[PDB]
């Protein structure tokens, strides 16, 4: 119905036709079953996308809509048991996260070895938003550069700076700052859920040929710790956007308290 597309990519998460097609050829064939207007479609999915990332949040993406009917099976919450971790006890700090409810604790890290899946949860996390930031830090002078107007923010490698550190505790923290950007321009990155992944200690600042631990305390008050450890191997699997919406719709379902501090525990 001329535009009435906007309102369906937007209730979708589709931000390329490449995407819709790949995800729903079926409805792609069938809106342009009478025409495929080059610029109507093309306008469709920039105002979707703009409407997406300038005013709609994680959860409208992360929270599946379907019931779960068996979450024994979810690759998420298998990880989580695995690990030692009462599974909704874990997914509720994860339904927290994606929803900025513990203000300040507004990172969850995801520490441990090279194939314990903690590269594998967040990686499936990011791509099942429709907008989701990667801090680079190739770009020691703006780490940042990717981080505004996106729902999720993945931190999946190397270290904070001296020069770094003030900027990068309010996005950890969900606190909105502004990132000078010399002449250009001062971009805004406004609360967005940090999720970091590391088989290192993330609260360790490089400045020049020391390290320091100076701002150990203010880092950790801003993260959920998580440790992973036993190794998976192949045939495990990856795990997949679906299961990444059923996992945060069975957390949503089965809400309890969560103890608001840097380690989580594993009682249960």
Not at 224 to 246: A, M, S
């Amino acid at each position: 119905a001329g535009m009435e597309l906007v309102g369906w990519l937007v209730d979708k998460g589709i931000t390329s036709e490449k995407q819709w097609i790949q995800e729903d050829q079926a409805s792609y064939i069938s809106f342009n079953a009478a025409s495929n207007s080059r610029s109507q479609i093309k306008a469709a999915l920039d105002n979707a996308g703009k409407i997406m990332s300038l005013t709609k949040t994680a959860p409208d993406y992360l929270v599946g809509q379907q019931p779960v009917e068996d979450i024994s099976s979810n690759r998420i919450y298998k990880i989580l048991e695995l690990n030692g971790y009462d599974p909704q006890y874990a997914a509720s700090v994860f339904l927290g996260w994606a929803t900025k409810k513990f203000g300040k604790r507004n990172t969850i890290w995801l520490f441990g070895p090279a194939t314990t899946g903690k590269t594998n949860i967040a990686e499936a996390i990011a791509h099942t938003v429709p907008f989701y930031g990667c801090v680079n830090w190739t770009n020691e002078n703006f780490p940042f550069n990717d981080c505004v107007d996106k729902m999720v923010i993945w931190w999946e490698e190397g270290k904070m700076t001296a020069k770094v550190v003030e900027s990068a505790k309010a996005i950890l923290g969900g606190s909105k700052v502004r990132v000078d950007q010399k002449c250009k321009s001062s971009a805004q990155i406004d609360p967005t859920p940090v999720i970091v992944t590391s088989n290192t200690n993330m609260c360790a600042v490089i400045d020049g040929n020391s390290t320091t631990f100076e701002h150990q305390q203010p880092l950790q008050d801003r993260m959920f710790k998580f440790e992973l450890t036993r190794r998976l191997d192949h045939d495990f699997g990856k795990v997949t956007k679906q299961e990444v919406k059923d996992f945060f719709r069975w957390a949503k379902d089965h809400v309890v308290e969560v103890e608001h501090e840097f380690y989580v525990k594993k009682g249960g």
